[PDB]
Amino acid sequence: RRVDVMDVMNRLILAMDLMNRDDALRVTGEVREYIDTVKIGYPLVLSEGMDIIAEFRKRFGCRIIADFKVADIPETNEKICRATFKAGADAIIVHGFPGADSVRACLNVAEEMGREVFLLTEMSHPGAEMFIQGAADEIARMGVDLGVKNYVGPSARPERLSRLREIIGQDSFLISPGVGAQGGDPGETLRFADAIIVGRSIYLADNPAAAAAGIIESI
Amino acid sequence: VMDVMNRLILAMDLMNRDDALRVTGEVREYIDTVKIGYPLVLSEGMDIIAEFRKRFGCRIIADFKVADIPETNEKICRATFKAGADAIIVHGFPGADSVRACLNVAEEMGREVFLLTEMSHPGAEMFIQGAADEIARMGVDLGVKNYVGPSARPERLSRLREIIGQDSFLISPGVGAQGGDPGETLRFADAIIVGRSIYLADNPAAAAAGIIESIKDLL
Ligand SMILES: O=c1cc(O)n([C@@H]2O[C@H](COP(=O)(O)O)[C@@H](O)[C@H]2O)c(=O)[nH]1
Ligand SMILES: O=c1cc(O)n([C@@H]2O[C@H](COP(=O)(O)O)[C@@H](O)[C@H]2O)c(=O)[nH]1
């Protein structure tokens, strides 16, 4: 679809937020036919340890995005990124709201370890309207100023998601949560995002495989 | 409320278990409250929290800067309280629903939430500073009683204290390595948080002793 970057399989990323290793491995195995890129966050890591990342990579041969919403001072951010890449994460998700130096600290580690940073510029939940939404454009422009090429932005009104894409450019890579459980539509979101992120609609389904196939079908 | 011992909280951001245990053991005489963050937890595991509580009989504040959607926030809080943390630090920038999610888990498990309203690093001026007063007011609206604000100009910390009232509990990082003065900060904060000035000291006990000496009249 793009010649400059390869799409994740089916342009669909699994948000694996189950907090039990057995369950997380089973459900992931059940949709691996459909998905080759898994987002692992604190719910799973704080429950089962950082070793889970390497276990996923070995068992499933998938890409791993560590969704750690990094949001500390530069010095602490560097330590978090280092531990995370040491654990085998292909990329880490970093909040933009704490400012440019905090983001730069993560970018520096990513450069040293040959990994990637995704910048979170805007969020999907209702609370996001209070403070994040007002800063979102400026956070995205900050990302561009810093040379960030990978972004996280939410499924939203076309006029909104289009604005993000306008800022970051067509050459940037954009992944988008808020699809399914939170009300976002997979197809509409993929008009602007390179990939959609889906958690509960898949991992809480009676039949995870059917949910995944069903989503892919709807597009 | 009872003061934290000597109004001094150790930021234990070493990433080796024996070094972390050693330094903490060396200053335990002076400090009975320890802030444990992702640098330590992501390197040594969540079990380090219960180990500290057992070995040192200290209260543990989990500095996880929780900054996700409500549903993910709830999972992170649950895992953290299950690991034995007495309190968790939550970002206010993501809005009221994300904070309420943490408050709800804290209520269910008999633990506490600290709201992070403003930060100490230069990047904090970009987006956080402009929202800090309103994040603090949101905290008041939600019934938050515990806050984190940075060691800074009396004006800044005074304004935060004004908003949260005299009854609220306020702790403040940015003391020592980042240039903050222990005595001036304790003018408004109930306790100061100190990391590198202690844990990177040739003599941590001596470093801790010196800080306390310098604030003798305020204890
Ligand atoms: O703005 C955002 C940013 C996120 O990372 N997320 C994350 O994306 C995932 C959404 O999962 P779900 O499809 O179950 O709503 C969760 O892991 C959540 O933490 C989000 O929902 N909204
Ligand atoms: O505004 C803030 C909020 C923090 O939690 N922190 C945290 O407080 C500690 C400061 O440690 P130090 O005294 O070495 O600067 C670190 O754990 C950092 O992540 C901070 O420095 N500034």
Swiss-Prot record, chain A:
Disulfide bonds: none annotated. Pathway: Pyrimidine metabolism; UMP biosynthesis via de novo pathway; UMP from orotate: step 2/2. GO terms for molecular function: orotidine-5'-phosphate decarboxylase activity. One of its GO terms (cellular component) is cytosol. InterPro entries: Aldolase_TIM, OMPdecase, OMPdecase_arc, OMPdecase_AS, OMPdeCOase_dom, RibuloseP-bd_barrel. It is an enzyme of class 4 (lyase). It comes from the Archaea. The active site is at residue 69. Substrate binds at residues 17, 39, 67-76, 124, 177-187, 199-200. One of its GO terms (biological process) is 'de novo' pyrimidine nucleobase biosynthetic process. It catalyses: orotidine 5'-phosphate + H(+) = UMP + CO2. Its EC number is 4.1.1.23. The keyword Transmembrane does not apply. Keywords: Decarboxylase, Lyase, Pyrimidine biosynthesis. Belongs to the OMP decarboxylase family. Type 1 subfamily. HAMAP family: OMPdecase_type1_A (MF_01200_A). Catalyzes the decarboxylation of orotidine 5'-monophosphate (OMP) to uridine 5'-monophosphate (UMP). Homodimer. This is Orotidine 5'-phosphate decarboxylase. It comes from Methanothermobacter thermautotrophicus (strain ATCC 29096 / DSM 1053 / JCM 10044 / NBRC 100330 / Delta H). The lineage of its organism: Archaea, Methanobacteriati, Methanobacteriota, Methanomada group, Methanobacteria. The gene is pyrF.
